[PDB]
Amino acid sequence: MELHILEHRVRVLSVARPGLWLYTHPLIKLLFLPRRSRCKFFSLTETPEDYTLMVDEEGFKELPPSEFLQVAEATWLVLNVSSAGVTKIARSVIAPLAEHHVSVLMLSTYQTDFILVREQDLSVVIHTLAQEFDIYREVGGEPVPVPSPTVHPIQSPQNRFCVLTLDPETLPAIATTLIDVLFYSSSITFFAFSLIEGYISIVMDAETQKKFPSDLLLTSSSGELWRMVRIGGQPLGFDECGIVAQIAGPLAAADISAYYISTFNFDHALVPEDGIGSVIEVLQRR
Amino acid sequence: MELHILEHRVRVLSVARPGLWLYTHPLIKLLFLPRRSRCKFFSLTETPEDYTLMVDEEGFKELPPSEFLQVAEATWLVLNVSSHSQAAGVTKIARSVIAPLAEHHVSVLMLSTYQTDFILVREQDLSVVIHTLAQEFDIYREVGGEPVPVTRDTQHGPSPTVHPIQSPQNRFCVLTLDPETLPAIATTLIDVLFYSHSTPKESSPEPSSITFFAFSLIEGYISIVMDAETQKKFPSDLLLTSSSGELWRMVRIGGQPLGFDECGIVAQIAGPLAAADISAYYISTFNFDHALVPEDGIGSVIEVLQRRQ
Ligand SMILES: NC(=[NH2+])NCCC[C@H](N)C(=O)O
Ligand SMILES: NC(=[NH2+])NCCC[C@H](N)C(=O)O
Known part of the structure; x- marks a missing residue:
């Protein structure tokens, strides 16, 4: 088994929802125009709280400082x-x-x-x-x-x-x-x-998927749907350890597959939809 | 022959190039999202100076005021x-x-x-x-x-x-x-x-x-005026031309910013072109006027327009 430290130097950012309009021009560039920047790591996550950005040093240069923009x-x-x-x-x-x-x-x-x-x-x-x-x-x-x-x-x-x-x-x-x-x-x-x-990944609501033009979004497991477990009451910060270990640990012991995405404030685990009952019960024992 | 007064109430605007970041959100909406706006009239023209907008009252609401926005x-x-019953x-x-x-x-x-x-x-x-x-x-x-x-029914420049x-x-x-x-x-x-990258704002008879x-x-109808070089950037079988071979040369009508009050600017161009039976499309921007003539006729057009008085 190999561990790879990739050629990326990433900054973690929060765009406040009322101030997204200001970042439309740089974000459209990073989303759609690869010749216009040297960015090779781009990740954008929309939640009720904020838009979370994980972006490399070059992509970070596209985003000017403002009151709407938090930097970890x-x-x-x-x-x-x-x-x-x-x-x-x-x-x-x-x-x-x-x-x-x-x-x-x-x-x-x-x-x-x-x-x-x-x-x-x-x-x-x-x-x-x-x-x-x-x-x-x-x-x-x-x-x-x-x-x-x-x-x-x-x-x-x-x-x-x-x-x-x-x-x-x-x-x-x-x-x-x-x-x-x-x-x-x-x-x-x-x-x-x-x-x-160069690889595109999209995590999407089933209702949101209906809005997209048909037969473009691809998946090997078509019809495999996932339920979200949201982790944390207070904003989690970036210093506390063992939060992912609290979730992935009991899930590994139960042998249930999971995706895991961290946003600026909260953690998000994706589990098979029919296994949600087992997942809540398993995590209830910490 | 008939003259039709269309069902539009239009405002004429200028977005300065350094203020593009503020207006990207409203402009993308008006360009690509017809369900999110009641706008039925939207015109956008890029020049080196600015972006000229001609937009109906509904689309006009999408654009907040700033030091970068000029409104006529x-x-x-x-x-x-x-x-449709010659140039x-x-x-x-x-x-x-x-x-x-x-x-x-x-x-x-x-x-x-x-x-x-x-x-x-x-x-x-x-x-x-x-x-x-x-x-x-x-x-x-x-x-x-x-x-x-x-059936019913002072100059400041x-x-x-x-x-x-x-x-x-x-x-x-x-x-x-x-x-x-x-x-x-x-x-x-x-x-x-x-x-x-755009051409610098900072003379030439033929730049x-x-x-x-x-x-x-x-x-509901789309119109695009575009450089021939720019056309090559687009996917192949989507842009529709109706012309095989001959394209258009621009005559930019300028000097000082033309404003919105002086009359006879279109007349002093279109009038001689009619007398010489030359085809002309004509686009006004916030600061200047732009006449498009057939590219092979450009020498004749310049000669004709330099006899103005
Ligand atoms: N902003 C966050 N989502 N923080 C939680 C991330 C996981 C946490 N830092 C850990 O090591 O377990
Ligand atoms: N901003 C402008 N493009 N102004 C010039 C438009 C033509 C001029 N108002 C005329 O009646 O002849």
């Missing part, structure tokens, strides 16, 4: 396990990093699971994981060999979610709908779009 | 002559519409599109317009999308002058599009309009290039 304190590095679910790395990655006081942010996409850590913790990350993983650093597309735990409240909306991908050539065909959804539109709004290393 | 005084009414465009109406309105001191704004030629007049001038044109035209007013017969002209070397296309195919060109249209891009959605 550190530069984040991106981790990836190779040879689509967080359950499989709960014991090997998530729990050991939580135990060694390394704070994470999660980004599950259609393609793979990204684990983000702060630049300051890389030495601790390597030390913790060098024994189990062959650790590689991505340079020029080539692999090169190298704050107190709390039980958090959980809730599940009735929304049914799809984890989707797209042929990068067909992105222009969904542009107007994606613009409409993002900038102009128990229930909780959740919309995630990411463009990472 | 008047509410404008839209006139149209359907004439094309505003040349068809130079003698019948444009010259008489100038003589009776009615200031105009022109918007030639793929479909037809729109003549914009200030609301306060409608009585004079009808009186000037009733003898030649059967005048109708659009009410609920149906024609209704019209600079003196009329001969305005300096220049002809940029760009080759322009007048294009339409199936409205159902607008989503397919959206990203390219966005890229061209809002994210491209190499000027930035000029016109898009309009009026009563």
